[PDB]
Design a protein around this ligand. Structure first.
Ligand SMILES: *C(=O)N1C[C@H](NO[C@H](F)C(=O)O)C(C)=C[C@H]1C(N)=O
Length: 263
Protein backbone atom coordinates (compact mmCIF):
# COMPACT_ATOMS: atom_id res chain seq x y z
CA UNK A 1 0.00 0.00 0.00
CA UNK A 2 0.80 3.71 -0.10
CA UNK A 3 0.07 5.61 3.18
CA UNK A 4 -0.81 9.36 3.51
CA UNK A 5 2.73 9.94 4.81
CA UNK A 6 4.26 8.19 1.79
CA UNK A 7 2.09 10.29 -0.56
CA UNK A 8 3.27 13.48 1.11
CA UNK A 9 6.91 12.35 0.86
CA UNK A 10 6.31 11.64 -2.88
CA UNK A 11 4.88 15.18 -3.36
CA UNK A 12 7.89 16.68 -1.51
CA UNK A 13 10.22 14.59 -3.72
CA UNK A 14 8.45 15.68 -6.94
CA UNK A 15 8.87 19.40 -6.01
CA UNK A 16 12.54 18.87 -5.02
CA UNK A 17 13.71 17.59 -8.47
CA UNK A 18 15.85 14.89 -6.71
CA UNK A 19 15.50 11.43 -5.20
CA UNK A 20 14.52 11.10 -1.51
CA UNK A 21 14.95 8.08 0.74
CA UNK A 22 13.39 7.87 4.21
CA UNK A 23 13.27 5.25 6.93
CA UNK A 24 11.62 5.69 10.33
CA UNK A 25 11.60 3.17 13.21
CA UNK A 26 9.24 4.12 16.05
CA UNK A 27 10.54 2.18 19.08
CA UNK A 28 7.03 2.78 20.81
CA UNK A 29 5.71 -0.15 18.64
CA UNK A 30 8.68 -1.13 16.36
CA UNK A 31 6.70 0.06 13.33
CA UNK A 32 8.36 1.55 10.30
CA UNK A 33 7.67 4.07 7.63
CA UNK A 34 9.73 3.77 4.45
CA UNK A 35 10.03 5.81 1.26
CA UNK A 36 12.44 4.31 -1.28
CA UNK A 37 13.60 2.32 1.74
CA UNK A 38 15.37 -0.40 -0.27
CA UNK A 39 17.00 1.92 -2.83
CA UNK A 40 20.77 2.62 -2.54
CA UNK A 41 22.04 6.14 -1.73
CA UNK A 42 25.57 7.47 -1.26
CA UNK A 43 26.22 7.81 2.49
CA UNK A 44 28.92 10.54 2.39
CA UNK A 45 29.79 11.70 5.99
CA UNK A 46 26.96 9.62 7.50
CA UNK A 47 29.30 6.61 7.12
CA UNK A 48 31.36 8.11 9.99
CA UNK A 49 28.87 6.65 12.46
CA UNK A 50 29.71 3.08 11.40
CA UNK A 51 33.48 3.77 11.56
CA UNK A 52 33.30 5.40 15.02
CA UNK A 53 31.10 2.53 16.27
CA UNK A 54 33.53 -0.07 14.90
CA UNK A 55 36.41 1.55 16.93
CA UNK A 56 34.13 1.66 19.99
CA UNK A 57 33.57 -2.09 19.51
CA UNK A 58 37.39 -2.63 19.39
CA UNK A 59 37.65 -0.59 22.61
CA UNK A 60 35.44 -3.12 24.47
CA UNK A 61 38.49 -5.44 24.67
CA UNK A 62 41.13 -2.66 25.03
CA UNK A 63 40.43 -0.26 27.91
CA UNK A 64 43.12 2.22 26.75
CA UNK A 65 42.37 2.13 22.96
CA UNK A 66 40.47 5.45 22.93
CA UNK A 67 43.57 7.10 24.54
CA UNK A 68 45.91 5.71 21.88
CA UNK A 69 47.70 8.52 19.94
CA UNK A 70 47.64 8.66 16.13
CA UNK A 71 50.12 10.82 14.21
CA UNK A 72 48.70 13.51 11.90
CA UNK A 73 51.06 14.53 9.08
CA UNK A 74 50.64 17.27 6.44
CA UNK A 75 50.03 14.59 3.78
CA UNK A 76 47.03 13.34 5.80
CA UNK A 77 44.97 16.50 5.35
CA UNK A 78 42.15 16.13 2.78
CA UNK A 79 39.26 18.43 1.74
CA UNK A 80 37.70 19.35 5.16
CA UNK A 81 39.91 18.98 8.33
CA UNK A 82 39.12 21.71 10.78
CA UNK A 83 40.19 19.71 13.89
CA UNK A 84 43.01 17.59 12.37
CA UNK A 85 44.74 20.63 10.84
CA UNK A 86 45.40 22.00 14.34
CA UNK A 87 47.35 18.81 15.16
CA UNK A 88 49.53 18.44 12.07
CA UNK A 89 53.02 17.22 13.09
CA UNK A 90 51.40 16.06 16.34
CA UNK A 91 48.86 13.48 17.49
CA UNK A 92 45.20 12.98 18.28
CA UNK A 93 43.80 10.12 20.35
CA UNK A 94 41.24 7.72 18.86
CA UNK A 95 38.63 9.41 21.13
CA UNK A 96 39.59 12.83 19.80
CA UNK A 97 39.43 11.50 16.21
CA UNK A 98 36.00 9.93 16.85
CA UNK A 99 34.65 13.17 18.37
CA UNK A 100 36.10 15.27 15.53
CA UNK A 101 34.70 12.90 12.87
CA UNK A 102 31.20 12.80 14.37
CA UNK A 103 30.74 16.29 15.81
CA UNK A 104 32.71 18.46 13.33
CA UNK A 105 32.61 16.05 10.31
CA UNK A 106 36.44 16.07 10.03
CA UNK A 107 37.40 13.91 7.03
CA UNK A 108 41.04 13.42 8.09
CA UNK A 109 39.72 12.09 11.42
CA UNK A 110 37.49 9.66 9.49
CA UNK A 111 40.51 8.42 7.51
CA UNK A 112 42.32 7.63 10.80
CA UNK A 113 39.28 5.66 12.00
CA UNK A 114 39.21 3.73 8.70
CA UNK A 115 42.96 3.01 9.00
CA UNK A 116 42.50 1.76 12.60
CA UNK A 117 39.97 -0.75 11.14
CA UNK A 118 42.35 -1.91 8.39
CA UNK A 119 40.76 0.05 5.53
CA UNK A 120 37.22 0.58 4.17
CA UNK A 121 36.48 -3.15 4.23
CA UNK A 122 37.11 -3.21 7.98
CA UNK A 123 34.14 -0.84 8.35
CA UNK A 124 32.01 -3.08 6.12
CA UNK A 125 33.09 -6.13 8.18
CA UNK A 126 31.86 -4.44 11.39
CA UNK A 127 28.54 -3.65 9.69
CA UNK A 128 28.21 -7.35 8.83
CA UNK A 129 29.12 -8.36 12.40
CA UNK A 130 26.15 -6.27 13.73
CA UNK A 131 23.64 -7.65 11.22
CA UNK A 132 23.84 -5.04 8.42
CA UNK A 133 24.17 -6.94 5.12
CA UNK A 134 23.59 -3.78 3.02
CA UNK A 135 26.14 -1.15 4.07
CA UNK A 136 29.40 -0.99 2.08
CA UNK A 137 32.40 1.26 2.48
CA UNK A 138 34.78 0.95 -0.47
CA UNK A 139 36.92 4.13 -0.40
CA UNK A 140 38.54 6.60 2.00
CA UNK A 141 37.94 10.35 2.26
CA UNK A 142 37.46 12.32 0.12
CA UNK A 143 36.60 10.01 -2.77
CA UNK A 144 33.87 8.18 -0.83
CA UNK A 145 31.74 11.35 -1.50
CA UNK A 146 31.66 11.22 -5.30
CA UNK A 147 28.00 10.12 -5.05
CA UNK A 148 27.69 9.15 -8.71
CA UNK A 149 24.19 8.01 -9.64
CA UNK A 150 24.08 4.22 -10.05
CA UNK A 151 27.51 3.67 -8.37
CA UNK A 152 27.20 1.04 -5.60
CA UNK A 153 30.40 2.15 -3.83
CA UNK A 154 29.99 3.74 -0.40
CA UNK A 155 26.20 3.25 -0.34
CA UNK A 156 23.49 1.82 1.86
CA UNK A 157 19.66 1.82 1.96
CA UNK A 158 17.48 3.87 4.30
CA UNK A 159 16.00 0.69 5.81
CA UNK A 160 19.40 -0.83 6.62
CA UNK A 161 20.88 2.37 8.04
CA UNK A 162 17.86 2.98 10.32
CA UNK A 163 18.06 -0.60 11.65
CA UNK A 164 21.79 -0.30 12.26
CA UNK A 165 21.51 3.13 13.92
CA UNK A 166 18.82 1.69 16.22
CA UNK A 167 20.97 -1.30 17.23
CA UNK A 168 24.03 0.96 17.81
CA UNK A 169 22.31 3.69 19.87
CA UNK A 170 19.30 2.08 21.52
CA UNK A 171 20.05 -1.68 21.23
CA UNK A 172 23.01 -3.86 22.21
CA UNK A 173 25.30 -3.86 19.19
CA UNK A 174 27.81 -2.07 21.50
CA UNK A 175 28.50 -2.53 25.21
CA UNK A 176 26.59 -0.14 27.53
CA UNK A 177 29.42 2.38 28.07
CA UNK A 178 30.26 2.42 24.36
CA UNK A 179 26.59 2.95 23.39
CA UNK A 180 26.40 5.86 25.88
CA UNK A 181 29.59 7.36 24.39
CA UNK A 182 28.20 7.13 20.84
CA UNK A 183 24.93 8.77 21.96
CA UNK A 184 26.84 11.58 23.75
CA UNK A 185 28.90 12.21 20.60
CA UNK A 186 25.82 12.29 18.31
CA UNK A 187 23.90 14.58 20.71
CA UNK A 188 26.84 17.05 20.55
CA UNK A 189 26.84 17.24 16.76
CA UNK A 190 27.47 20.80 15.52
CA UNK A 191 26.24 20.40 11.91
CA UNK A 192 22.61 19.26 12.23
CA UNK A 193 20.31 22.23 13.00
CA UNK A 194 19.19 22.76 9.38
CA UNK A 195 18.45 19.04 8.63
CA UNK A 196 16.17 16.55 10.40
CA UNK A 197 16.00 18.62 13.57
CA UNK A 198 14.71 21.68 11.70
CA UNK A 199 11.53 19.66 10.86
CA UNK A 200 10.81 18.45 14.40
CA UNK A 201 9.24 20.11 17.46
CA UNK A 202 11.81 22.13 19.32
CA UNK A 203 11.18 20.23 22.61
CA UNK A 204 12.45 16.92 21.05
CA UNK A 205 16.09 15.91 21.65
CA UNK A 206 18.16 14.85 18.57
CA UNK A 207 21.52 13.18 18.06
CA UNK A 208 22.50 13.06 14.41
CA UNK A 209 25.17 12.83 11.76
CA UNK A 210 24.82 14.77 8.47
CA UNK A 211 26.52 14.21 5.16
CA UNK A 212 26.87 15.93 1.80
CA UNK A 213 28.68 15.26 -1.40
CA UNK A 214 28.57 15.66 -5.18
CA UNK A 215 25.23 15.40 -7.02
CA UNK A 216 23.83 17.74 -4.37
CA UNK A 217 23.75 14.78 -2.00
CA UNK A 218 22.30 15.87 1.34
CA UNK A 219 21.86 13.32 4.15
CA UNK A 220 21.06 13.01 7.84
CA UNK A 221 20.72 10.02 10.19
CA UNK A 222 19.21 10.69 13.62
CA UNK A 223 18.10 9.27 16.90
CA UNK A 224 15.28 11.28 18.35
CA UNK A 225 13.97 11.47 21.93
CA UNK A 226 10.41 12.93 21.43
CA UNK A 227 8.62 14.75 24.28
CA UNK A 228 6.31 12.21 25.82
CA UNK A 229 7.20 8.93 24.02
CA UNK A 230 9.74 6.28 23.12
CA UNK A 231 12.71 7.14 20.89
CA UNK A 232 12.60 7.22 17.08
CA UNK A 233 15.30 6.52 14.53
CA UNK A 234 15.04 8.48 11.29
CA UNK A 235 17.22 8.35 8.13
CA UNK A 236 16.76 10.90 5.33
CA UNK A 237 18.89 10.61 2.19
CA UNK A 238 18.62 12.94 -0.83
CA UNK A 239 20.54 13.10 -4.11
CA UNK A 240 20.11 15.06 -7.36
CA UNK A 241 20.80 14.46 -11.05
CA UNK A 242 23.54 17.05 -11.75
CA UNK A 243 27.06 16.72 -10.32
CA UNK A 244 27.22 20.40 -9.24
CA UNK A 245 23.70 20.56 -7.59
CA UNK A 246 23.36 22.61 -4.41
CA UNK A 247 22.76 21.10 -0.95
CA UNK A 248 19.06 20.86 0.07
CA UNK A 249 18.98 20.48 3.86
CA UNK A 250 15.49 22.00 3.78
CA UNK A 251 14.25 18.88 1.94
CA UNK A 252 15.46 16.73 4.85
CA UNK A 253 13.74 19.08 7.31
CA UNK A 254 10.50 18.83 5.23
CA UNK A 255 10.73 15.02 5.24
CA UNK A 256 11.18 14.99 9.01
CA UNK A 257 8.19 17.38 9.43
CA UNK A 258 5.99 15.05 7.33
CA UNK A 259 7.15 12.05 9.46
CA UNK A 260 6.50 13.91 12.75
CA UNK A 261 3.01 15.06 11.59
CA UNK A 262 2.24 11.38 10.73
CA UNK A 263 2.85 10.12 14.29
C1 LIG B 1 30.64 14.57 4.78
O1 LIG B 1 29.63 14.36 4.08
N1 LIG B 1 31.49 15.55 4.45
C2 LIG B 1 32.47 16.09 5.52
C3 LIG B 1 31.91 17.51 5.77
N2 LIG B 1 30.53 17.28 6.33
O2 LIG B 1 30.16 18.41 6.99
C4 LIG B 1 28.82 18.37 7.34
F1 LIG B 1 28.62 17.48 8.27
C5 LIG B 1 28.01 18.01 6.12
O3 LIG B 1 28.26 18.52 5.04
O4 LIG B 1 27.01 17.14 6.21
C6 LIG B 1 31.73 18.35 4.50
C7 LIG B 1 31.86 19.88 4.59
C8 LIG B 1 31.42 17.76 3.29
C9 LIG B 1 31.31 16.23 3.13
C10 LIG B 1 32.29 15.87 2.04
N3 LIG B 1 31.86 15.79 0.77
O5 LIG B 1 33.48 15.68 2.31
Amino acid sequence: QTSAVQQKLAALEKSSGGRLGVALIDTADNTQVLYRGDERFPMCSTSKVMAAAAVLKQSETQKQLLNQPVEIKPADLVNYNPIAEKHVNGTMTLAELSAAALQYSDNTAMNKLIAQLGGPGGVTAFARAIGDETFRLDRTEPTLNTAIPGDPRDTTTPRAMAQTLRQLTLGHALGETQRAQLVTWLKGNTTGAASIRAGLPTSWTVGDKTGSGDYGTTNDIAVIWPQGRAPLVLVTYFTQPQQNAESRRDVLASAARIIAEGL
